[PDB]
């Protein structure tokens, strides 16, 4: 006689638990995962140019240490600095290594274009036990430690012009005897100076002289400058004793290179998201795997899981 | 749910709906049956999958930033540098935190309109022919075969031909 | 509110209704009285309490940061200091502030929804007993005593007792 | 025959007022408020370990300004300097106190270790009229003011080993005479020098010679610095003349330890939130007393009121 | 929408409304109308506009505060000063994001149920006389001349003058 | 017989596109831009004291070159750098350059104060042909190049004590000798010294000798320091040769001043809002021209446009 018709929604046996603005705990149908929470534990070779310092700090390689000879004008989107690397060259202190490790990081090239000094009065190529190349005593490969010759160290005064369009790196430094002897032994004069100014700005360091502790079999030290020439300006350095001297300069460049610090595999893969906890997926709006990332990255958010409602409320049946 | 369909005036759901978010079940001279309103169900997946979209296709790069992690103790700067994360990260966390509260809470409002959608859709459909009995089922007073509900359920059913034969059900 | 029954259709409200959030008042034979509905009263409560608990079970600890007053001028490295700190509070700020706008906004309607869901809950029980006056009130068209009355409100009241009688009533 | 049932909702005489998307002002029955803007005026005595400075800042109580020595070892979840606070002792400068006081604040430990490093060749425990531990002459409890004995003052080198397994923090300094009659007096050598250095630091500051503002009667000053030793390494202090020598060292610590600038008085409760104008509680989201915080604390926002609806809109009846 | 009034049982928009947001549409003996209700758009516009205004006569002032653009390359402090800010413009560009995205959504459903109240509170007026063909409009069983829908529209409408003869007509 | 009553709402031609938490595109009729995106290129005179560099930093007009000397005691809610401007004074090299512009240009005002030198027993107002002033050699107007007198330099000792009742902004210096014979000849003593203190403060500058990148035909240069002298306390300048003497002191005064770079022409006109760009209304909460600002402006964002839905959703008709 009647017809009866009814309408209804669907359900599912075990649903997914979510939050909203008024229940920090609701049920629906199917949802979806805001949160990437874990990674492959490896590194993707590359949307990026991927560069594993092996043993080398970025610094080390940029100053020459021996060892880090390979990274010799080696480039990269991002460098990777690893936990276990080391030092095996000559006692060096850089004031703001920070910075410097930062502005050549952001560059993202280690191009050493060689210029022809003239340092006339002295002995270059100086070297150390503290840096052996091979069975001799060496030193940083970009720098030239320079000391007395026939009995005299001369006032030095080089000029180095900046006749290119980009910017130069020059990267040099002063040196602290353990003594006053080894200083006037070395440098002649018992108050060496290294002044490194261009027509924007001067830098004039004093050397320091004491003991300090033996760091491979040395008790003196390296402290380490830079100067930034600009297209138009040229370098000039004033020193007549302890100066560190430069061989040339480190071409500047502008990009997406940075830096750091993981002990990662370098796997064969294709992600665009890097942690120092490997690569990771970014389809997801959010990560909770390390707030250190680089490239096209999920912001980093304190939560481990987070739920989108894809479905409606799950009311069971019965 | 802001219209109090699902979890509401309905009862229960059909964990046997398989085909379908929502449906129709019903009960005739010839029987049982049950199927699945597409028009519908696509009408609240279609919303949701946008909804979705405008939050998962969307990431930006970030390259060269900031240290974040320190081997050694410096004061100010670091402080300064600390801070800074922290703060981007709170007010990050809070951002997710919020976002999902309040898609989740659209989303569940969403579904239950799109219930109530179709059962005011089917009320309108038959008229003055069927009586809400207030469980989200009509009581259809007419016989009413397979081929009658489903031109119901097709959205072609043409309440004049049995308005007499209700009409006579429905007050008597 | 979305839903125009509370400042909408329903004229004003009650301050004599003391017992609850919704309710009845209603005129006959026997007189004129007023109930408040528990179970949709209770309905809105929970919801807006959880609301309001995720609000203010949360804070979060800091306890090392910057510095944020300074006796003395330094600049690059102050100005830093101040500008991070002012941008993170503007950025709460407006947290704050966005944060009970839309609160508030999902709160006047949920109630306004809850009021409604009473309604069209209470219109599908009458059935074809009564009718639906627009200011809130449903005309009942038979004798319905104060048993009536509560069978209504408890929601045990059977259309099937009554019907004939208000059928009579109603089209004639 | 009839019957008339009407559905309602309530109202209240005195409502609320709220904001929303639609409205800046609207009416509700009942709101909350969010944000916490009152004080007790006083800071708790508890959860956190709170410790007063006084009269002395916490920079002066690690030196061992004489009025500060009842600080010695001190600990602190949260430091609290007083404005009031003065330094009775020889006048100093130190080149980023900021930072100085900072990790000090954090380490929220005074534990201070004797060495015994040994001057050979000087007098020591030198002290001044501007350093009146009691009626007598005095100077810093942690430092050693270094002279001249019988004549002369050697080119010191002393070390000291880390052989712990944590870091030790050494606080020295360097004395700036206030004339060249004062530095031969005092050093015999005509200009000295300080050099301080671990195998990963090295720092060397030169006396500089000059008359400054005489306070409590010295136009001298000294200039403060400090050297983390980390584990396995070792600190050489090297210098022949002018060095103000440590005593021995700072165990540091990392936890949740902080300073704060305040003049509220410390009573006896329990708050969870600490702030300059005192505790305050934290079940509220926001709070508009002070952006400086500690512990557990609602966000600090400029809107000083906030009210979270939690009842319907308020319609009355006329 | 979430009520699914507009661009839902209500087939389309009328570009012939030039003077209202929702109005009515008729057919009488006298022909065909229409007009603009000015309760109901003005409701809606009235609602719209304060939304709007919580979000123009807003700025805050900002005076000295950090450099942003550098001519030479410094390292940690300046990377610092970089990040802060680019940090601040995402935290607002996505705050931007998001208040437009919840505004306009918010924004449709309101006008969509505004438009729904409209024709409930015709519905309710019109009470037994009608009855709903499901296209947003109401078929009257009962001569209606210009004046009898103009009192339907200004509200006015006497549904028990025309109730017999309306009663007749639906169930005959 | 029967009437049809029908209920509606309006749609328009063309509508507006917009996004909703459902839809990334949604036609709605109408709708308003919240993102200011255009300038008009010119930087409106006004609410705010606007002051053009012209050609001169706020830095060269702060010492004094001489064309800069028409900004003597210049004010400024928004001093505005233009890219043209050049330096013709004396080289000079300041630590800290940024700085000192910016407590400056947040001082908003040069207000200087000459005080009584007291240098006796050398010569003053040394020049430069390297800072022409006029067809004479000059050199920055608040400065003071001290040089021998008599075959002597003094062991300078001068002091001047804050009497008022707000901070002086004291700015001194130091000159670099391009050579040895440069230094005895114009100071005497082979190594000079300059050092300026307070009884909060001192600063001790060494000169350093050596040859410089000519500027305007001088090798050597000038290192430019500064210092903030409180109420009740009083400054101390103690040299023996290389110091540049200052003539008084600049007002420091807090407010809402600042400095800004920009190449946009000021015109007469009314705009809260400032950009490098131009000013700009404030009227949209959001505006994409610069994130460069000054005064009342909307905030910055990414987006270049963002709708605020302002009509129902638009449903034409077939
Ligand atoms: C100032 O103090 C410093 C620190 O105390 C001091 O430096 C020390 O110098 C001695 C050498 O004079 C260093 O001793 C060396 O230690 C290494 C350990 O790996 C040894 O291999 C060295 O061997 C030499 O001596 C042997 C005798 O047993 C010979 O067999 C051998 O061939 C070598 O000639 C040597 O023992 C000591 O390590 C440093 N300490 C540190 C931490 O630097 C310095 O001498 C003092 N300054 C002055 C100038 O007095
Ligand atoms: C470089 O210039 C500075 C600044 O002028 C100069 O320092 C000044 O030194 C004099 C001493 O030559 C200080 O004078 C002292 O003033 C205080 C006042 O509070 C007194 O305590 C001292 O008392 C003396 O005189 C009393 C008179 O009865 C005696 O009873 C008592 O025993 C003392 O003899 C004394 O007068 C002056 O305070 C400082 N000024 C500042 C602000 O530093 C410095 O000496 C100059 N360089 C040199 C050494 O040439
Ligand atoms: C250390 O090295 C530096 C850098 O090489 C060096 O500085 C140079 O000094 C020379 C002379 O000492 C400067 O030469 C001058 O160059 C300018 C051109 O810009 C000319 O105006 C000068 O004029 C000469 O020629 C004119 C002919 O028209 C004559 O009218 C006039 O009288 C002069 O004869 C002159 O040639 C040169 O500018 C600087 N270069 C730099 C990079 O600064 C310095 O000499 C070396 N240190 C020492 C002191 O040994
Ligand atoms: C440029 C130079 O002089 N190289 C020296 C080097 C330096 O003097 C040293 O690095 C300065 O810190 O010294 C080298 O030997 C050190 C060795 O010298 C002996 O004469 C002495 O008997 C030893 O105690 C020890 O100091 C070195 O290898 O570093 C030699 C090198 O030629
Ligand atoms: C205060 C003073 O002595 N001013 C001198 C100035 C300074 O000595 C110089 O700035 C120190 O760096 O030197 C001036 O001269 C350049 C001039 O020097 C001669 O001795 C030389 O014979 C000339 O060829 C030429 O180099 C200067 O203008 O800077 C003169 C000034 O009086
Ligand atoms: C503002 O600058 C003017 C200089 O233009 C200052 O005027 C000098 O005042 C001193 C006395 O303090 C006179 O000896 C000079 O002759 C004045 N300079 C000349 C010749 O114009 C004035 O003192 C400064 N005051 C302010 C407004 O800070
Ligand atoms: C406003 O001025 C800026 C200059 O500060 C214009 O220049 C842009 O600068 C940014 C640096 O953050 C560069 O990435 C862009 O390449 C520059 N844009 C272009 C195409 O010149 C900026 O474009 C100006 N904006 C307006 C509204 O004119
Ligand atoms: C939810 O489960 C369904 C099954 O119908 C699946 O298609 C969907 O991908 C899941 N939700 C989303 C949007 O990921
Ligand atoms: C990198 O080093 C090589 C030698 O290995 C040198 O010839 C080359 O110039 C350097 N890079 C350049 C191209 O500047
Ligand atoms: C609806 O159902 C009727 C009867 O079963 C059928 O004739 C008609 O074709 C159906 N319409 C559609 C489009 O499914
Ligand atoms: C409803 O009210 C009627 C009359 O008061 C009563 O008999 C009935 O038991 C009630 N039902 C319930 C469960 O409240
Ligand atoms: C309810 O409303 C009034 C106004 O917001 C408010 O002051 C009162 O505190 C609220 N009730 C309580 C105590 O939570
Ligand atoms: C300070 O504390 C250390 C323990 O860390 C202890 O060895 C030393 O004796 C204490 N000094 C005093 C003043 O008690
Ligand atoms: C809190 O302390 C600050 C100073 O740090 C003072 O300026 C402010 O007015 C005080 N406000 C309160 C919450 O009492
Ligand atoms: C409503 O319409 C009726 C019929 O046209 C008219 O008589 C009455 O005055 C109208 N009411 C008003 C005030 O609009
Ligand atoms: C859109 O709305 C704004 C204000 O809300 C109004 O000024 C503008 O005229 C509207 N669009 C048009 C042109 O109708």
Known sequence: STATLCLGHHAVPNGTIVKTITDDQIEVTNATELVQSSSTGKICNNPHRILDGRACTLIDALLGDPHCDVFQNETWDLFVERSNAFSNCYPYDIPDYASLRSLVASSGTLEFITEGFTWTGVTQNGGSSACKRGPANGFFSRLNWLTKSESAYPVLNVTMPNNDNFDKLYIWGVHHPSTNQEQTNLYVQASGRVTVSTRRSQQTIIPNIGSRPWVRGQPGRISIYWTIVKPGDVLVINSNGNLIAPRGYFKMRTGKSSIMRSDAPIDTCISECITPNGSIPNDKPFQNVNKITYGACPKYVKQNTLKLATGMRNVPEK | ?172
Do not use: P
Request: hydrophobic share 35%.
């Open chain 2, 1 to 172: 749910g802001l219209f109090g369909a699902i979890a509401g005036f309905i009862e229960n759901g059909w964990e046997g709906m398989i085909d379908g978010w929502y449906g129709f079940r019903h009960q005739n001279s010839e029987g049982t049956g049950q199927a699945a309103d597409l028009k519908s169900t696509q009408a609240a997946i279609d919303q949701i999958n946008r909804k979705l979209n405008r939050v998962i296709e969307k990431t930006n790069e970030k390259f060269h930033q900031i240290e974040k992690e320190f081997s050694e103790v410096e004061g100010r700067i670091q402080d300064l540098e600390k801070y800074v994360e922290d703060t981007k990260i709170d007010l990050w966390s809070y951002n997710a935190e919020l976002l999902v509260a309040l898609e989740n809470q659209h989303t569940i409002d969403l579904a239950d309109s799109e219930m109530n959608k179709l059962f005011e859709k089917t009320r309108r459909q038959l008229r003055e022919n069927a009586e809400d009995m207030g469980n989200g089922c009509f009581k259809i007073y007419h016989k009413c075969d397979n081929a009658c509900i489903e031109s119901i359920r097709n959205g072609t059913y043409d309440h004049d031909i049995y308005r007499d034969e209700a009409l006579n059900n429905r007050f008597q």
